[PDB]
Each structure stands twice: as structure tokens, then as C-alpha cells.
Amino acid sequence: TERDASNWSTDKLKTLFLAVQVQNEEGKCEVTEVSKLDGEASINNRKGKLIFFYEWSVKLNWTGTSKSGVQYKGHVEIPNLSDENSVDEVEISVSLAKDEPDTNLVALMKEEGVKLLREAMGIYISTLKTEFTQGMILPTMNGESVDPVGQPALKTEERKAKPAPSKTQARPVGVKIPTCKITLKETFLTSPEELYRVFTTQELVQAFTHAPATLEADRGGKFHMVDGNVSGEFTDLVPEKHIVMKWRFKSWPEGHFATITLTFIDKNGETELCMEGRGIPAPEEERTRQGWQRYYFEGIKQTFGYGA
Template structure:
């Protein structure tokens, strides 16, 4: 892995045969034969950090905890290319609110602070403070959030750094003056990826860049108080999708049909359809590397008046595992139950 601040060929600005200013870089100054360039990524970083943090959710036998709101996000981020050396700069002060729900249904509220998220600190050295709100009674959920929650937060912060290094490479592999193309190396993150502990990890190449993305697979299971026929329709009928996502959605419920929902943040294509039994789709978040899709298989099985849904997911970027799981639980399973009254016990 390259040391922090060393040159990365994906980012080196060259003399170009097509005179393209890749990704709207700001040309700062000329130094001999080297150009110094800078790109402001503050707005993108702010949106990405909020998105990743709001996907944090941890569970134990005592209950579950999740980040409910990012109340403060102040700072800046930029990327500089100086004499062939890539320098990432980011510095953030983050405050958030978290909630915990016990197995008995009691809801607790707390605060979260990250005062020193910056390129000068390793992920393990970043301070993450977790506390309960004033007058909240003590609860084991605080310990859960301080341990498992903090680990998940470090993971998603590491994911932010990884995205910072890969998100803007799209379109940069273009012809150079000598007609050669540079093949980017496998991206590395400064984050502590050992804490991810996914069930299975592999590497999937990103079609647009050739970069191998570490991926994982996982399974989810949920029970709905409805028939397989009705639940099958929920995923394929455009009006029903619009109902449980509470917004515009485009759904072509045929084999090969495409879908787009949640303000364009989720899109994909139906690859295989077995009526009332199975749905296979390629599926992605908008923020994933360009053209990278996970494979989702949904099995529907009748269980005495209820329907057991088994979801198999492969090809998810490792840093996105928790957010993807949480997204399916919140924006699909829970939303479908609440909208259509299919509520049932949780697994």
C-alpha cells in the first residue's frame, strides 16, 4: 500500500493528446515540467459521510442501536496533485444523535462526537465519544454502542477514505500523449478493514476502471403476513413500489426490465423471474463505483399463511456491507410491512 501522500498513477495529471481536463481539475500553477492541481471535494465528502454514518446499525440480545441524525458536520476536503505526488486532505468535526431500542421496546437517546477525523490520524487514533442524553437512565445499549457501534463507525469512516481515493477516478483512464493507457492498481484504504469481518470476501473488477473491488456476500431472512403472490407483486408493480418508497419510482416488472427508486439512489435490472417464487436482480447504490452491481436473489416460500423471504446478496463492496443490509431492512422490509400491513415477527 502506498504511504499517505505518495503518488498514485490514477491521479497523475499528464500532457494529454485530447487536451481533456479530466474531472474538472483546477489548474493551480506551473512548476517547470510539472503541474500542480487541486480539487475541492468538500460537498461530496459531506454528503458521503452523512450517508455512511446514517447506515450504522448494531444489534445484540439487549436490543439495537442506530445513528438517527448527523447534527453537525463541519470541515473541508480536497485532493492535490503536486509534482506527481497525490495528497489527500480532509478535516472534519462531526456530531450525531443515536437511538437505542431495547427488546422490551424502550427507546433511549444519545449523542456521538468525532472531533478529529482528518488525514493526520490513523483510523484507530480517531476519537469517537458516545454518551446518553441528559436524564436518560443507564442502559446496556450504551455499552453496545461504545463497543460494536464504534467499531462500525470506524469501518464506515475507513470506507469514506476508500471512496475518496476511488470515486473520482471514473473517466480518468483516457488516451495520453504517447497513446498509452495506464492501468490503475488495486485501491487501498487507510481504514482498518480487519474489523469488517464479512461472511465471505472476494474481489470484483469495476468495469469502468479495471480496479478490483473487495466484495462480500450475506443472507437476510424476514417473514411477512401475506401470500407469496402478493409479496411478489410488491417488488414488480410500479405503483406498489412507489407506495412503500413514498416517492417516484420507475419499475419495468419483466425479465430484463430496469428499475430506479429512492430518488435514483437505487437502480438495477430484473435478470430472472419465477412468478410468486423467485426474483433475481442486479442491484446497486448510486454511490458505488460506476457500473458495479451486486447480485440479489429473493426466494419466497409459503409458511402456513405467511411468506418467508430469503435474500441472498453477492458482490457488495466490503465497505458497504452494513449500509446495504440496513438499507434492505429499513427501506424494503420495514417499509413494505408498514405500508401494506404485512407486519410479522422479526428474525
């Protein structure tokens, strides 16, 4: 528990206030009488924890003479402004020269009068905490240091092998997951041969996917797109004629793909892609269809400009 040493506050702040200095008659300043910061304040710390929270106001008065030969005694008072923030930015009330032709005189006070108070804030912060606690700290360190060693770490072995599909054996996959059909028929402002590449050319995929993808145009080729959120394999790749591929979202169950089949048709100017998606999870059905054209047709149509 720390106490707000107000004794030193008024002591210096009051003096600093009753110590207002004057420059030239053009912009001179003199203190006639200063009250003291009247309010309640409290701070908490213990050698490494300085937090300031208070609410008080100060009231004083000064005099400013002008070469014109006019003297005026203004009043200054700052409400419950909190010094927790930039103390110098504290809002201070001023009422000098404004009533007399001096005016400009106060302008200097604004950069010299209230300024003097700025210094009052310096000791306020420092003196108030530069007694109860000390800001003197020393380096810290451990006599001995230790680094990671034996910890629940995972370890696996790797090997080289190149297995290929065999007619004699088969490895079917799938889970008792809901499913539906996503047949889409869209016309492309491009030739079937052109669109074919888009579905069988990575660069082109990475183009309309506006994301990183990986594509292998081969029977069993692996295609991964949309930041790899989309993955599958090519079950068939008829040159610009037809493509059968497995499809899924990275959010789909492991070993769960939708049977997708794309067909290419020359419409003498454009192409009619006949899609036939099956196995698409019912819960993901709305997603699949929506995430299709948008990233597929509607995507290509925009990226490549094959739309109508």
C-alpha cells in the first residue's frame, strides 16, 4: 500500500506556483497568491509497479503588465484532470490579458506561464514517487541455465518407395456420410480445348483460384487448390473431351470424396461444360455447389473471361 505524498506536492508545486517568473513588460508574469492542489489522490507501487490514479484541482492567480502600461490580474484553475496521462497536456484554465488590451501578453503566459506549471508536473511525478519508492534496479539472471532435452516429442521413420495402382488389388474409400448430387451445366465463352487446360493446368488453376494450388494432369493425378482447401485425384482425363475426378473440401471426412465428372462440348463459339457431381455430403451440399461455380466456372469466367 502506497501513500500519495501530497506534503511534497503542494510544497514544491505551491512554491513553483508562487515562483512564477516575469520576463519583459511585453510579456511579464508575477504570482500574487497560490492556494494548493485541493482534491483526493492515490498511487500504488512497491519498487517495480508505478500506477497513478487521482482527481484534484489547483487554484491560483497572477499578474501581467503590458508595455501599454496596463496591469491585470487573471485567474487560473485546472479541474480534476488526471495526470495519469501526459501531465503537460493537462487542461489548464486561463483568464489573463483577455479582459485587458494586453491579450498577447497571456499568449506568452500560455507558452511561459502554464509552461512553468509544466515543470511543476515534473516534480509532481518524480518527487511524489521519488521518495516512497526507488527507481534504482539492478541486472537479473540465473546462476545456471538449462535448455530443452527430454520431452514428450514425436519421432517417426521415413523410407523411399514408389507404389502404383494395381488392377489385381483395389483400395476403395468412403464413410457412411450423407450425400447428394451437384450437377452443374454452364456455358463458357471459350473453346472446350481452352477450358480443358484450366481444369488440367495448374498455372491456370492457380489463376482462377487466386490462391496456391497444385495440379497433376494425369489419370490419378492429384489436384490440390484453394490454399489446398480443395483436393482430389483424376479418375479420367479425356483430351478436351471428359474428366472424371474425385473431389472434396479440406473440411470433409478423411477418405470422403464426391464423384465429379466434367464433359467438354464445342458450341461453335463457346463451350458447354456438363458437370455431374455425386457423393457430395448433404451437410456440405449447399457449400459444395456454392463453392463450385464461384471458384470454378464463375471464377474462371471472370479470371479468364469465359463468361457471358
